[PDB]
């Protein structure tokens, strides 16, 4: 199937508590592979997946060098954005950056991304055509013009269609043994009376990868989205994911209900019944 490489930057100012803190993480699909933490002792871009460790010292020197540079850029942008919004010197603020590319099964470019945020909300985003910007507010309009005057959209597109996709392909190759497997969900169901009239049926999906999955309840073959509870898909801590969906049913009626599980790793979608 398809694949993506994605970088996430977080800069948080802390007035009085010293200089801003910077975290960078890199993902290929749902697997983290690199990390930088400006407060950590190493001051190096660090590996987080085995297949990236096979990159030489020169790779790590350049990655370290560029991530540090990015952190300085965010540092002054933090001050600059404080001016745009006329914010005081003493509050804590946040810049977030996400960018990356998608490739198809053949390895071809599909799409690129670049989005920034300030204090948890949209600031500026590269549009689908990778050719223009959408500025959410008035302070970002100023930034939008600086970037038009710098032709930053071309430069973004240069990375997204160039180094991004080709290092994605590289990583996918160097990590084929792990990044191209689909672990299908191991499913089970639990059953707990709530009272003498009702019981909970809970449908579990465990140990799956990638994270994309669908759990749905049915009653007599029709979708039931009512007296159901879906939890957010969650990391197990070992590279795989978990999810569950529960339904409260009338006692003696549990045989009417089916849980359906759709996952890429399944030859065909499962149906579970108590």
């Amino acid at each position: 199937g398809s694949h993506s490489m994605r970088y996430f930057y977080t800069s948080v100012s802390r007035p009085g508590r010293g200089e801003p803190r910077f975290i960078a993480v890199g993902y290929v699909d749902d697997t983290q592979f690199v990390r930088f933490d400006s407060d950590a002792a190493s001051q190096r871009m660090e590996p987080r997946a085995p297949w990236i460790e096979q990159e030489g010292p020169e790779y790590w020197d350049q990655e370290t060098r560029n991530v540090k540079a990015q952190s300085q850029t965010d540092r002054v942008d933090l001050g600059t954005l404080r001016g745009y919004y006329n914010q005081s010197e003493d509050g804590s603020h946040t810049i977030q950056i996400m960018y990356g590319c998608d490739v198809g099964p053949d390895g071809r470019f599909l799409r690129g991304y670049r989005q920034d945020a300030y204090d948890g909300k949209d600031y500026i985003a590269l549009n689908e055509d990778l050719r223009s910007w959408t500025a959410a507010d008035m302070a970002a309009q100023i930034t939008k013009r600086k970037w038009e005057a710098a032709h930053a959209a071309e430069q973004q597109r240069a990375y997204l269609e160039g180094r991004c996709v080709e290092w994605l392909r590289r990583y996918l190759e160097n990590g084929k043994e792990t990044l191209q497997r689909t672990d299908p969900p191991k499913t089970h169901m639990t059953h707990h009376p709530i009272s003498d009239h009702e019981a909970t049926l809970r449908c579990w999906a465990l140990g799956f990868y990638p994270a994309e999955i669908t759990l749905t309840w049915q009653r007599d073959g029709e979708d039931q989205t009512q007296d159901t509870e879906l939890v957010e898909t969650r990391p197990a801590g070992d590279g795989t994911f978990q999810k569950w969906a529960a339904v409260v049913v009338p006692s003696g009626e549990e045989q009417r209900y089916t849980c359906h599980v759709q996952h890429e790793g399944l030859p065909k979608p499962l149906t579970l019944r108590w």
Partner: peptide, 11 residues
């Protein structure tokens, strides 16, 4: 590998 081109895009 991270994009070098972002480093200069000051806001």
């Amino acid at each position: 590998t991270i994009a070098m081109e972002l480093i200069r895009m000051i806001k």
